Paper text:
To gain insight into the structural mechanism of PMP inhibition in the presence of γ5 and [name], we supplemented the purified protein with 100 µM ZK and 100 µM PMP and subjected it to cryo-EM. Data processing revealed two populations of particles. Reconstruction from the second population of particles revealed densities for two γ5 and two [name] subunits around the [name] TMD, molecules of ZK bound to LBD clamshells, PMP at the extracellular collar and SPD in the channel selectivity filter. The resulting [name]–γ5–CNIH2ZK-SPD-PMP structure is similar to [name]–γ5ZK-PMP, except that the latter lacks two [name] subunits and SPD. Comparison of these structures suggested that binding of [name] to [name]–γ5 complex causes slight splaying of the LBD dimers, clockwise rotation of the ATD layer, movement of γ5 away from the channel core and counterclockwise displacement of the M4 segments. Nevertheless, all these changes are minor, and do not affect conformations of individual LBD clamshells, LBD dimers or the closed channel pore. [name]–γ5–CNIH2ZK-SPD-PMP showed apparent asymmetry of the intracellular portion of the channel pore, which has not been observed in AMPAR structures before. Cysteines C589 formed two pairs of disulfide bridges clearly detected in cryo-EM density, illustrating the twofold symmetry of the channel intracellular entrance. Crosslinking of C589 cysteines was not observed in the [name]–γ5ZK-PMP structure or in the absence of PMP ([name]–γ5–CNIH2ZK-SPD), indicating that [name] and PMP together are the two factors that cause strong deviation of the AMPAR inner pore from the fourfold rotational symmetry, likely due to increased protein flexibility in this region. [name] likely reduces the potency of PMP inhibition by influencing AMPAR gating equilibrium, supported by conformational rearrangements in the LBD layer, movement of the transmembrane helices and altered flexibility of the selectivity filter that results in C589 crosslinking.
Synaptic complexes of α-amino-3-hydroxy-5-methyl-4-isoxazolepropionic acid ([name]) receptors (AMPARs) with auxiliary subunits mediate most excitatory neurotransmission and can be targeted to treat neuropsychiatric and neurological disorders, including epilepsy. Here we present cryogenic-electron microscopy structures of rat [name] AMPAR complexes with inhibitory mouse γ5 and potentiating human cornichon-2 ([name]) auxiliary subunits. The core of each complex is a Y-shaped tetrameric AMPAR with a three-layer domain organization. Auxiliary subunits are membrane proteins that associate with and regulate AMPAR trafficking, cellular localization, gating kinetics and pharmacology.
Residue numbers in the entry:
A (entry chain A): 59 to 205
B (entry chain B): 10 to 498
C (entry chain D): 206 to 254
The structure:
Amino acid sequence: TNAFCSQFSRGVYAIFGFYDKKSVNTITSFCGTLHVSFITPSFPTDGTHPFVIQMRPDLKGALLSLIEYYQWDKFAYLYDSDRGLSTLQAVLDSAAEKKWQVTAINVGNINNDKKDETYRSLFQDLELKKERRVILDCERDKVNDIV
Amino acid sequence: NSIQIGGLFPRGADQEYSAFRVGMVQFSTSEFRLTPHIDNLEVANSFAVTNAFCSQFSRGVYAIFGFYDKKSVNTITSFCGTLHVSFITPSFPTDGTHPFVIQMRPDLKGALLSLIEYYQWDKFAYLYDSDRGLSTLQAVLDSAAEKKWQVTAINVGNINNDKKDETYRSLFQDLELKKERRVILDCERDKVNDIVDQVITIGKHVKGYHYIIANLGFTDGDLLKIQFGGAEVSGFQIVDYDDSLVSKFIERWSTLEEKEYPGAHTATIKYTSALTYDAVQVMTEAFRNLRKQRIEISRRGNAGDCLANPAVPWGQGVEIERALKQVQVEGLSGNIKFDQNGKRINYTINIMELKTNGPRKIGYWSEVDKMVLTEDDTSGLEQKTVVVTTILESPYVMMKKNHEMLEGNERYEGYCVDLAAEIAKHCGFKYKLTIVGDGKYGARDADTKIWNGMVGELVYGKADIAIAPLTITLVREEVIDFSKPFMSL
Amino acid sequence: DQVITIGKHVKGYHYIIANLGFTDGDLLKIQFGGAEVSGFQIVDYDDSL
Ligand SMILES: O=c1[nH]c2cc(C(F)(F)F)c(N3CCOCC3)cc2n(CP(=O)(O)O)c1=O
């Protein structure tokens, strides 16, 4: 908020920047009220929003297309709350219509000292159905930490 | 003295602002007067929430009471954590450890996970609305992996107003295909009413269906419509209408006028309004415990704007937070006690259940023990257990080889044990195999005229049927009733 | 209204309405659910007059 209003004082004609899950609502409301265009490489907002120009295209379509290609019916879906929950809602709604057996697990509330401790308890519970198909839904730092 | 506070209410918080002003009356003690402000706004609009916060911060407030949605929840906790202005809410409990936000909707995650374990579910649906995070969906999906559940969560949040009818109807047709008899409705009062209107219209409130309503508002929507039919709808409730403070309240709640206090002439309070009434109790006692320690606060009246850069804190703000979180008052929702974060600790959720006479408490959940199953421990009105009498005779009844480690109707085997199992599934009853006492078949004594054996237990009431090698004779036919012979010899 | 409330408009039930007024009462309420309600009508709404 305080950075957005300092831009509005100096009178800019476009605001380029990133947002998070905890700041997507702050931006799209401030940009939708004070009518200021916002170009972002962050995740596309889930919902018709004016005045916000998303540069990251979409992944909900291509991820559901790739699952059907490999003809999966019983995978596991490790996800991360930051960058939103839209892709989780996509694969859960397509699981009902296509008889999947998703085993969605939040892996984003992990602190960096019980890191190894929880991850061993994580893949323990994946051997409770013996899951051989995982969809890492994280971004680069946490993907390398799981790999 | 007088404490200035603030107010953030949605356009449509009629009963919540009514129950606010009722607690303004009843919790004044006139040494201090918590004079409030009013800033009716859109909660799902981060501009208006920011604007109204800074205005109140400008106008010298010590605690802001408001509601947030999941489009302003991170706007609230950031501003209230940077500028230390404490925030009291009855809205949904945040996912995390956000300080300086005192939250009164306690938790329904552990109560909902306990109730599914109680009914022994393995396949259910989880119709949810976005509406307040996804923290309850994420709790049941994490527990699905380890507790062998098969959640089938669909996303009833984005259904448009015009095409509501064809969308709900096509939804339960999909649940019909994979035969989802068990459904969990994680919506609020408005959308729970819209869903239960649709399960009636297509006829899925009949016997066989179960419906847990994941809401601390069970007796706050229309349940009369689904009370008959055969559905076994359960739920949760914090406002118990059978206790002292609530029964006093419903008396003075019903006497009010629906012209100055809207939605206040009934005998059912919404849980958001009750926790709003419980909030002014906490805000009173916290500044009363700030009167009791002889503490005065915040000589400011000055602070011109929230966006200060450098954002300057105010050191009394920590102390007001300290006061608000050690408030162990009791109110409409039970034992109001907060932890170090602002999340309600020890509290009680009444697991209600809807039956033909009405809603009916069948347990209570607390954080400390578990879901404690209350009374209705005895009242079931069973069919009957039928006392069937036989005698130890081969192959009619023989004790099984390992009869020491067995108990019930499976200690025994033989012809009459297999016969009693066949009589039970044609006549439809449940039986108790009972070897006779004396060890006779039955004979009337020549002197005392007392029947012994298996005839004597049917004449004298100690038995209900004798599935046994009992010979059809003349003197037994006069006192008991035989069937046609199952064995001629 | 009462067969809806106790849940007897589901599949398996039939309901002939002995009335020359079939499309003159609320039938939308019982149109979904599985009941096979028939009836009679003299006013045909597909003809000239
Ligand atoms: O109702 C009766 N049913 C009986 C059934 C049996 C059996 F065969 F075991 F089923 C026997 N036995 C026959 C051989 O000696 C051992 C037990 C006696 C029975 N008696 C006594 P009884 O008829 O006066 O002899 C009854 O009164």
